[PDB]
Design a protein around this motif. Structure first.
Motif, PDB file in Angstrom:
ATOM      1  N   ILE A 110      82.432 -26.250  -7.960  1.00  6.89           N
ATOM      2  CA  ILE A 110      81.025 -26.081  -7.634  1.00  6.89           C
ATOM      3  C   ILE A 110      80.572 -24.649  -7.868  1.00  6.89           C
ATOM      4  N   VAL A 111      81.375 -23.674  -7.443  1.00  8.67           N
ATOM      5  CA  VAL A 111      80.940 -22.279  -7.470  1.00  8.67           C
ATOM      6  C   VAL A 111      80.611 -21.813  -8.883  1.00  8.67           C
ATOM      7  N   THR A 115      77.067 -20.269 -10.159  1.00 10.25           N
ATOM      8  CA  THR A 115      77.038 -19.028 -10.926  1.00 10.25           C
ATOM      9  C   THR A 115      76.901 -19.216 -12.428  1.00 10.25           C
ATOM     10  N   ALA A 116      76.775 -20.436 -12.920  1.00 10.11           N
ATOM     11  CA  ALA A 116      76.672 -20.648 -14.359  1.00 10.11           C
ATOM     12  C   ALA A 116      75.350 -20.093 -14.865  1.00 10.11           C
TER      13      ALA A 116
ATOM     14  N   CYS B 202      79.456 -14.671 -16.838  1.00 16.21           N
ATOM     15  CA  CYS B 202      79.037 -15.310 -15.597  1.00 16.21           C
ATOM     16  C   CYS B 202      79.835 -14.785 -14.411  1.00 16.21           C
ATOM     17  N   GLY B 203      79.176 -14.726 -13.255  1.00 19.31           N
ATOM     18  CA  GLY B 203      79.806 -14.357 -12.003  1.00 19.31           C
ATOM     19  C   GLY B 203      80.011 -12.878 -11.778  1.00 19.31           C
TER      20      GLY B 203
ATOM     21  N   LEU E  46      70.645 -13.813  -8.380  1.00 13.67           N
ATOM     22  CA  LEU E  46      70.311 -15.179  -8.001  1.00 13.67           C
ATOM     23  C   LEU E  46      71.301 -16.180  -8.577  1.00 13.67           C
ATOM     24  N   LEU E  47      71.683 -17.149  -7.760  1.00 13.70           N
ATOM     25  CA  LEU E  47      72.495 -18.280  -8.164  1.00 13.70           C
ATOM     26  C   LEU E  47      71.620 -19.400  -8.710  1.00 13.70           C
TER      27      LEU E  47
END
Ligand SMILES: Nc1ncnc2c1ncn2[C@@H]1O[C@H](COP(=O)(O)OP(=O)(O)O)[C@@H](O)[C@H]1O
Ligand SMILES: [Mg+2]
Lengths: 120, 314, 178, 227, 167, 281, 227, 411
Positions: A110-111, A115-116, B202-203, E46-47
């Motif tokens: 999910i994470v 964050t995608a 990403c991330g 932001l996510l």
């Protein structure tokens, strides 16, 4: 006065071939992720939710287990797309894929959806 | 393992004395408190009050025995034990936004402060005006800097940006060092040269660390990945996708094995295969620091968390 | 603020101690001499008493106030006893029995205001404090006997007994305990 | 006149019956209909004793428990009691509050051989006859269908109670003029659509599917398409 | 259509992955500290917002950021009377957003109620018990609505007799 | 309050004071007071021509004349009689009392003063009640436009007097709640058998009225009371009149206060949820 | 240290105690029920020290609060607390005698004679605190003087028409003996005035004999040091 | 419109009802509501929460002061509404029983105590628009109305539109300056001393001295002696000497009737007479943490006002609300101010060598018969005007905005 003025700113041929697991393995071949396109992202989902609804509950376990780790992460991004505008009952099926997919991928899968930065 | 709680509220950062007989921790406020190992229990011995806002980073220079602290106050102070009292010292940080992280270099002659200003500030001491003066690494940074780690050469500085990317810069201050020894991350290094930059997009990157042989960095990312990148190979990254929650802190513990912690609140362990470059997960909150043995061969480490207190391990 | 502060501190008066030593008009004996005018620090504490006890704040304006606040507490202690008296005659002798009791002198522990009164440094102040503070009490009691007992029935008069519950800024000359 | 004795009398009697075993056919010389009518008046108006408003719950609990061992729609002396009463305003109200929360008041003790859920049993008898169906006010009848159609679609498959609520709906459609007003029909049709197609193996679900089929083939308005 | 237990379990797991907050002094004001989900002045903090939905009416939006997460819910309004009861239920609850510390004083447009959880709450309150509250809210709200409907019938049924009986 | 009291309380209180004080023999003092009522009937109490010794009361009914067609004056001549005077100019009916001639006890006199609204409406109802005894039903519908938006119709049918209120529910929140209340009224005949029967229509005027072109709208209700002879006879009529003439505001009063009842329980159920969150601390 | 605070804060809740608003009674009771238990389940060395803690402010709070609260339902619990507190230490008695508590009991007893259950404890507590016979503020004879004594002489002779248990005659004898104990000599004695002022001295005059032949006395139930 | 607007003024002691345009309030009633009670049927399972129609068995006003079988509640404290459940039940019965008004057809003017929080202005607006569907509401500043009541009553030659009003009702005392029809909002001060705390002080002062007062009636007798016998004295300690020496005659007797036994009881009334009113001049007698005499709070107000208006404000101080009725209360405040003001000018004489003598400020404190209801009477003379109907918020504005239409306040 002054402070008012702001400044500072092929799938069907695998499905009807019976071993429809081979279709889903093929459905993951069409990610629009890297592209700037937007109409294609509306096509990409429709090609998969048509697949997701086809499975019998006797198979939806293996249809996850036969994916690689990228496959599960790929699938979860399609799952969270169908929830954005359900079909008349298809939520009943997405929530059942979600059960299996989250069992395989864990919350970590999910994470890297949350964050995608670029998505299908 | 063992556990102790210093306070109910988050211990935002910690540092240790050279012989580990004291720790510095910030009690979620504008101060830092120093504790001594008076038996099994901890006794508070000194209280550094001078900051005007919540502090968010400490490092306690082992041999020099001087503490650096920074925070949202923007100010950073280097603290000298001037007899029975720690006295601060001004640092002319030019930063216009909150400071976020600090570490001393291994030679203890310079340190660097990360900040939301989209810069790293490297610091060294002017002898003639009694303050520490800054130079900024500024060019390809484009978001706040969350974590810093210093190469064994005291010149290369890996820096975790909130820009989905981990970067290595040469912080070569010519006023303080001879031109640095050649290194696999690249012979060309003036001040601010961009040595490396992660492939992914990403991330946020919460933590970075250099192995005790500088040829391997690893970094830890809010997409629930740990990556390690190898300069004996051609800077080749390898990433492990994991089913944990995000990880917040990382450190090496051998030249080929790695340890991390995070929102799952328990330590986890990785190994790095020198052949295929495959990581693997061994398994078991907000900081890890090796207590004894350094990154060459760890034998103890400490972790402090928002949930409060510290733990010590094996 | 406008509480009644001590009036008598004319600078020509001697000022021995941490408090105004003042010329207590009495037939008792002590270090202080005899006032001849009709007004005196014990009469002042008596006169202002009914007002003073309502003011919940009180400065030390001058040295004589550190006297007056102590006289006020002892006056309260008088009422805490005379209220029980069965007649005025008992109200006199059972008051003398109170005056010669070992009240905490301000520098002694258990006095309620040790923050406000400096220690008496030597015998020639300490023994003066013993010989002054008794001369206060010995006189102060004999003045209330004449006017708490209203003359019709040697009842302790109701109006005075009302104040038995009220203490000057809630401090008590019983200290931490009698 | 003894409020406390009366309170404990109703409570202990419910406890005694709470396990649901048949009495010999002799106790009904007292615990039959003549007693049940008395209990209803204790709920519908009570006694000047009951300043704690406490007798109502005790007597409602007793009526449910006392129904727990009664075989059939005509022999049921308790369903006869409601039929002959004047009007059951307050009892109608109180019972739906229990179905809404889903709890069973009668299972005060916890012994292992759990009886049928007393309220779902109680309603299935109430709708056993069209004469006893009339007791509910119309606005409660609507609320009853909304309450039962919430439950049927909340439970998982294989859950023991789904084979009860399906039976209650079948009764409601039978003896109450449900098809006149169709209160939740364009929702219930979509529910019966999927439980009829639900692919699970356990006997609980097998039993569920049978009544769902019967629920359609008895009334072709159900299972046909929403429109 | 979708049953309760699978739908709730999906929302729980997603929310558990979003509740991974940290403190963050803002980039765009000298040292203000503010929840990025609300001010939205930075746009790499932001996510990706994700929706979980049981059917076309009932859904949850999970919307995160490095220091804050917002959760907004919509509940099945099963008939006209229930719309009014639901809206007023929220208002009297939302009117105590200073005691429900995680609750916004206004909902998002098109949502019935919405919670803003900051890093301070996840540092000062037990995370798994806040999530249990959000889950418990969905487990109960349509029971709490229906119970008012039963009582509003009863009030009117008394008021009618109190008028008619005196003829 | 469940029911709404029919006496205008201000009228009782003002007159009670004046007549007590006057009979106690105090010299009088002026009164100069104007006050409203339900249906927008507007009172005035005044001293006529400034005579502090005289007191006057007047009604100002917006719909007086159309009611007056049914003989209202010959009712007022009965219940007040010698206390009537010319209309205080601007008001439809006026009542005058002398502080010099107050009788030995006043209570019924001040109570009759308090009902000076109800005593107007009684003239239209006492008519059609009585015609039911005469067995006639050919007389036309009464119509009272008791508000701008709202109209009351009365017909004497051979067995049944039927009164049909038309009323407007001013909000989406009101009409949805009103639809519940009137539904219970329709069933009230179950709870207490002897009551008059009630009917309700969600929007349209009922068919029997439609020749009158009765108003139509999403906010309009039509409510019929069917008064059987047990309610209209000469023994009951005073009690039935006190009730029916209030009915419109009785319904709205409970629609309003039904909200307060909901609001109280929402605060209670909020406090329940709050105790659940508090376990997170 | 909690309960004494949460009472002493409702004392001088100047707004609420005269112009009430919240549902206070149902929580205050819980404190007093708990306090009544701990005043006897704890080590007396603890509760003694909590009473004399700060020149008896803990006591003067509850004594003030008894005068301040007009609800009969609570007063019983404050009296029961004074019962235990009187037992702990004679020093507490030396406070209560010198305090307002006797005089409010004197007025309550003369006025609220209907409250038979409280009236029994009212007599008992007044008898307990007087048991040490210390001197009493002269203001108290405005109530506990001769009129209150004649009021006692009525009860022991006539009982009460409401007296279901008929206990009060005995407790009034104890109370008469208790009030008498502190009185000086035989001239001014307020009770001896009352005895001289009525011919209504029969059952009392005899009942004193049954104590005299019993040889003990009921006073000094606590047996504190200066017996 | 044809029908008059309602004016409903709610205070913490009393509320004042009537239609606009009348000369005088049509009901004055205590601000009390007596809700139904139970023998602990309300408990930890549920507190004061009703079912069915059990909530409508209650009364308000004098119909609620003397009913035996009900618990009296007082919803308004320090002028602020503390429990809106009881206040909404209070408002309903005001409208549908006492006023006989239909809320859907009459404008409402309703009063703001100048301390209240904006949330309370939201909730009060939510009542009238969303609970009652009032067509329009206006929330009036109580002090400005009190000035308008003086203005229309007093002689046309001195209708200054400028003055400081002191509004010592129950709850809290406001001191508010108005210059030429504009509130100087920055200068408003609140003094916590008010009729309740003067009552409470007298109640304690009696209960320590005069036990024999039955607990049910302590409050009633404390109010009686406050109203009937109390006065502001000339010099505090000089009264105590007079009361000692002439205790035969300054002491007074009050006879009360026992509510339960119907026996009479008597109390001696004494130092109560001048303590109390002097709490306005020595606030520390009643509060731990307020100390400026009212005669020195009012000076600070004028001295913060713009320099031109200062002298006129001294020329016209208006007394409002019931507690300002105390004997000599005007005389003393005028004496204290006068003694302060001309001493201040004595300084500026010397800093100029006596070279010029300033025109001394005259100070006036004005008592007028409206004092018991000047807030309502002002409200009535406002709500009569055709202007008033356009200052009010029309109901549609409550639809388009939220209730936030009442967030604003002029302070
Ligand atoms: N004769 C009087 N002397 C002094 N004060 C009075 C007198 N009569 C009434 N009062 C005070 O006036 C108050 C009346 O209410 P008021 O203060 O006018 O309204 P509000 O309740 O809005 O403050 C009473 O509470 C009392 O405190
Ligand atoms: Mg007021």
């Amino acid at each position: 006065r002054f402070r008012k003025v702001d400044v500072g700113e092929e799938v069907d041929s695998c499905l009807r071939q019976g071993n429809m697991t081979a279709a889903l393995q093929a459905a993951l071949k069409n990610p629009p992720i890297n592209t700037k396109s937007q109409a294609v992202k509306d096509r990409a989902g429709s090609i998969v939710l048509k697949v997701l609804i086809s499975f019998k509950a006797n198979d939806i376990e293996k249809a996850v287990q036969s994916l690689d780790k990228n496959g599960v992460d790929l699938l979860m991004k399609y799952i969270y797309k169908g929830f954005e505008s359900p079909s008349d009952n298809s939520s009943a099926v997405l929530l059942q894929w979600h059960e299996k997919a989250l069992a395989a991928g864990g919350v970590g899968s999910i994470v890297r959806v949350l964050t995608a930065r670029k998505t299908v | 393992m063992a556990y102790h709680s210093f306070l109910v509220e988050p211990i935002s950062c910690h540092a240790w004395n050279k012989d580990r007989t004291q720790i510095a921790i910030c009690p979620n406020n504008h101060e830092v408190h120093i504790y001594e190992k008076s038996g099994n229990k901890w006794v508070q011995v000194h209280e550094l009050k001078e900051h005007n806002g919540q502090v968010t980073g400490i490092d306690w220079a082992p041999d020099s025995n001087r503490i650096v602290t920074c925070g949202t106050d923007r100010n950073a102070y280097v603290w000298t034990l001037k007899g029975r009292t720690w006295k601060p010292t001004l640092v002319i940080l030019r930063i216009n936004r909150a400071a976020r992280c600090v570490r001393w270099a291994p030679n203890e002659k310079k340190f660097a402060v990360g900040s939301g200003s989209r810069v790293i500030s490297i610091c060294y001491f002017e002898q003639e005006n009694d303050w520490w003066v800054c130079k900024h690494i500024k060019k390809p940074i484009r978001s706040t800097v969350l974590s810093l780690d210093w190469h064994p050469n005291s010149v290369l500085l890996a820096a975790g940006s909130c820009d989905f990317k981990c970067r290595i810069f040469s912080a070569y201050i010519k006023e303080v060092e001879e031109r640095p020894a050649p290194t696999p991350w690249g012979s060309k290094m003036p001040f601010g040269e961009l040595m490396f930059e992660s492939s992914s997009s990403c991330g946020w990157v919460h933590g970075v660390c250099f192995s005790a042989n500088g040829s391997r960095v690893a970094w830890v990312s809010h997409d629930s990945t740990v990556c390690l990148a190898d300069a004996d190979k051609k800077m080749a990254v390898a990433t492990l996708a994991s089913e944990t929650l995000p990880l917040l802190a990382v450190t090496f513990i051998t030249e080929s094995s790695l340890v991390a912690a995070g929102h799952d609140c328990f330590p986890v362990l990785f190994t790095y295969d020198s052949a295929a470059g495959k990581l693997s997960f061994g398994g078991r909150v907000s900081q890890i620091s090796v207590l004894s043995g350094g990154k060459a061969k760890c034998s103890q480490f400490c972790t402090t968390g928002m949930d409060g207190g510290m733990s010590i391990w094996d | 603020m406008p509480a009644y502060h001590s009036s008598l501190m004319d600078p020509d008066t001697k000022l021995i101690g941490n408090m105004a030593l003042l010329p207590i008009r009495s037939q008792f004996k002590g270090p202080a001499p005899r006032e001849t005018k009709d007004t005196d620090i014990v009469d002042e504490a008596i006169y202002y008493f009914k007002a003073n006890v309502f003011f919940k704040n009180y400065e030390i304006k001058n040295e004589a106030d550190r006297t007056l606040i102590y006289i006020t507490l002892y006056i309260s202690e008088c009422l805490k006893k005379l209220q029980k008296c069965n007649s005025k005659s008992q109200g006199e002798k059972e008051m003398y029995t109170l005056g010669i009791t070992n009240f905490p002198i301000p520098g002694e522990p258990g006095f309620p205001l040790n923050a406000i009164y400096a220690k008496p440094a030597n015998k020639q102040e300490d023994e003066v404090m013993r010989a002054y503070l008794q001369q206060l009490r010995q006189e102060t009691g004999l003045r209330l006997c004449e006017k708490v007992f209203d003359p019709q029935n040697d009842k302790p008069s109701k109006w005075w007994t009302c104040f038995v519950k009220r203490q000057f800024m809630n401090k008590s000359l019983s200290g931490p305990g009698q | 006149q003894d409020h406390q004795k009366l309170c404990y009398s109703a409570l202990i009697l419910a406890m005694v019956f709470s396990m649901g075993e048949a009495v010999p056919y002799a106790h009904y010389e007292h615990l039959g209909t003549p007693f049940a009518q008395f209990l209803l008046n204790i709920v519908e108006d009570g006694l000047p004793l009951d300043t704690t408003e406490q007798l109502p719950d005790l007597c409602v609990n007793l009526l449910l428990a006392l129904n727990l061992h009664l075989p059939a729609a005509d022999q049921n002396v308790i369903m006869a009691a409601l039929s002959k009463h004047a009007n059951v305003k307050i009892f109608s109200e109180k019972l739906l509050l229990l179905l809404n929360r889903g709890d069973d008041p009668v299972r005060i003790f916890k012994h292992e051989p759990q009886p049928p859920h007393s309220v779902l049993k109680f309603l299935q008898d109430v709708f056993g006859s069209p004469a006893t169906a009339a007791i509910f006010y119309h606005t409660d009848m609507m609320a009853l269908i909304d309450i039962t159609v919430r439950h049927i679609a909340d439970l998982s498959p294989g859950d023991k109670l789904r084979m009860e609520y399906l039976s209650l709906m079948h009764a409601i459609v039978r003896t109450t003029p449900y098809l006149q007003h169709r209160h939740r029909l364009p929702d219930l049709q979509a529910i019966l659509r999927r439980i009829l197609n639900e692919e699970e193996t356990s006997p609980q679900c097998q039993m569920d599917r049978m009544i769902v089929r019967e629920m359609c083939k008895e009334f072709l308005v159900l299972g046909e398409a929403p429109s | 259509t979708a049953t309760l237990r699978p739908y709730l379990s999906a929302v729980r797991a997603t929310l558990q992955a979003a509740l991974c907050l940290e403190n963050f002094s803002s980039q765009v004001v000298e040292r203000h500290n503010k929840p990025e989900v609300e001010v939205r002045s930075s746009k790499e903090l932001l996510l990706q917002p994700v929706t979980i939905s049981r059917n076309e009416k009932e859904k949850v939006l999970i919307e995160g950021s490095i220091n804050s997460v917002r959760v907004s819910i919509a509940v099945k309004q099963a008939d006209e009377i229930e719309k009014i009861l639901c809206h007023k239920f929220m208002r009297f609850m939302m009117m105590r957003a200073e005691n429900f510390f995680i609750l916004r004083r206004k909902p998002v447009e098109g949502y019935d109620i919405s919670f803003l959880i900051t890093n301070f709450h996840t540092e000062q309150m037990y995370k798994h018990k806040l999530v249990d509250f959000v889950i418990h809210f969905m487990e109960e709200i349509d029971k709490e609505i229906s119970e008012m409907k039963l009582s509003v019938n009863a009030r009117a049924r008394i008021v009618a007799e109190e008028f008619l009986k005196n003829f | 309050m469940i029911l709404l009291e029919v006496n205008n309380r201000i009228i009782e209180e003002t007159l009670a004071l004046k007549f007590e004080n006057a009979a106690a023999g105090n010299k009088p003092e002026a009164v100069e007071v104007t006050f409203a009522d339900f249906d927008g009937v507007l009172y005035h109490i005044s001293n006529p021509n400034g005579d502090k010794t005289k007191v006057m009361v007047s009604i100002s009914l917006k719909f007086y004349k159309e009611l007056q067609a049914h003989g209202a004056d010959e009712l007022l001549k009965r219940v007040y009689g010698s206390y009537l005077v010319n209309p205080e100019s601007g008001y439809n009916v006026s009542l005058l009392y002398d502080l010099e001639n107050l009788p030995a006890s006043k209570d019924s006199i001040v109570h009759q003063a308090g009902m000076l609204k109800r005593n107007c409406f009684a003239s239209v109802f006492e008519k059609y009640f009585q015609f039911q005894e005469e067995g006639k039903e050919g007389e036309n519908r009464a119509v009272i436009h008791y508000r701008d938006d709202e109209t009351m119709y009365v017909e004497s049918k051979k067995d049944r007097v039927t009164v049909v209120f038309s009323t407007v529910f001013k909000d989406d929140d009101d009409v949805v709640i009103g639809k519940v209340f009137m539904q219970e009224f329709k069933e009230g005949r179950r709870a207490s058998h002897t009551a008059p029967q009630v009917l309700f229509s969600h929007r349209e005027p009922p068919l029997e009225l439609k020749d009158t072109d009765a108003a139509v709208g999403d906010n309009i209700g039509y409510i019929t009371f069917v008064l059987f002879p047990r309610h209209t006879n000469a023994s009951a009529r005073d009690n039935t009149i006190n009730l029916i003439h209030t009915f419109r505001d009785y319904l709205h009063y409970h629609i309003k206060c039904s909200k307060a009842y909901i609001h109280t329980r929402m605060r209670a159920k909020t406090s329940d949820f709050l105790k659940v969150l508090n376990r997170a601390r | 240290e909690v309960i004494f605070a949460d009472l002493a804060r409702r004392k001088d809740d100047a707004q609420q105690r005269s112009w009430a608003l919240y549902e206070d009674e149902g929580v205050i009771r819980c404190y007093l029920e708990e306090l009544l238990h701990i005043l006897t389940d704890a080590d007396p060395e603890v509760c003694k020290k909590m009473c004399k803690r700060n020149e008896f402010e803990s006591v003067l709070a509850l004594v003030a609060y008894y005068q301040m609260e007009h609800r009969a339902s609570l007063r019983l619990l404050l009296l029961k607390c004074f019962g235990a507190m009187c037992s702990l230490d004679a020093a507490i008695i030396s406070t209560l005698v010198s305090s307002v508590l006797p005089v409010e009991l004197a007025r309550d007893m003369q006025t609220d004679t209907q409250d038979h259950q409280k009236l029994c404890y009212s007599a008992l507590i007044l008898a307990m605190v007087f048991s040490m016979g210390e001197a009493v503020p002269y203001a108290h004879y405005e109530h506990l003087g001769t009129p209150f004594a004649q009021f006692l002489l009525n009860i022991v002779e006539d009982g009460l028409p409401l007296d279901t248990t008929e206990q009060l005659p005995d407790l009034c004898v104890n109370l008469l003996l208790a009030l008498n104990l502190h009185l000086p000599a035989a001239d001014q004695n307020v009770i001896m005035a009352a005895l001289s002022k009525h011919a209504n001295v029969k059952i009392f005059s005899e009942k004193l004999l049954l104590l005299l032949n019993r040889g003990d006395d009921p006073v000094r139930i606590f047996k504190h040091e200066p017996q | 419109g044809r029908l008059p607007a309602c004016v409903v003024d709610c205070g913490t002691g009393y509320t004042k009802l009537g239609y606009a345009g009348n000369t005088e309030p049509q009901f004055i009633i205590p601000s009390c509501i007596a809700i139904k009670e139970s023998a602990k049927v309300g408990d930890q399972a549920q507190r004061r929460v009703m079912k069915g129609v059990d909530d409508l068995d209650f009364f308000i006003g004098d119909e609620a002061i003397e009913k035996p079988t009900y618990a009296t509640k007082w919803p308004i404290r320090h002028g602020i509404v503390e429990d809106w459940d009881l206040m909404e039940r209070f408002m309903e019965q005001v409208i549908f029983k006492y006023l006989r008004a239909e809320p859907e057809d009459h404008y409402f003017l309703l009063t703001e105590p100048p301390l209240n929080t904006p949330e309370n202005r939201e909730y009060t607006a939510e009542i009238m628009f969303e609970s009652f569907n009032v067509p329009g509401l206006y929330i009036a500043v109580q002090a400005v109305l009190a000035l308008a009541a003086s203005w229309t009553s007093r002689q046309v030659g001195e209708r200054t539109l400028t003055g400081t009003v002191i509004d010592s009702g129950d709850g809290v005392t406001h001191v508010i300056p108005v210059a030429e029809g504009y509130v100087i909002g920055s200068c408003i001060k609140h003094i916590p001393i008010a009729g309740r705390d003067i009552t409470y002080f007298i109640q304690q002062l009696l209960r320590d001295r005069e036990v024999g007062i039955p607990p049910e009636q302590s409050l009633e007798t404390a109010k009686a002696v406050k109203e009937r016998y109390s006065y502001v004295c000339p010099d505090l300690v000089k009264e105590f000497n007079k009361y000692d020496t002439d205790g035969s005659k300054w002491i007074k007797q009050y006879t009360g009737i026992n509510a339960i036994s119907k026996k009479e009881f008597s109390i001696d009334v004494g130092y109560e007479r001048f303590l109390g009113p002097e709490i306005f001049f020595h606030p520390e007698f009643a509060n731990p943490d307020f100390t400026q005499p009212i005669s020195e709070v009012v000076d600070e107000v004028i001295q913060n006002c713009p320099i031109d208006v200062r002298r006129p404000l001294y020329k016209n101080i208006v007394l409002s609300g019931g507690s300002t009725m105390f004997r000599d209360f005007g005389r003393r405040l005028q004496r204290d101010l006068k003694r302060t003001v001309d001493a201040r000018l004595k300084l500026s004489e010397e800093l100029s060598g006596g070279r010029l003598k300033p025109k001394p400020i005259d100070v006036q404190v004005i008592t007028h018969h409206m004092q018991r209801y000047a807030v309502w009477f002002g409200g009535s003379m406002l709500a009569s005007t055709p202007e008033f109907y356009q200052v009010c918020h029309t109901k549609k504005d409550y639809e388009e905005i939220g209730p936030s239409i009442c967030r604003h306040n002029p302070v």
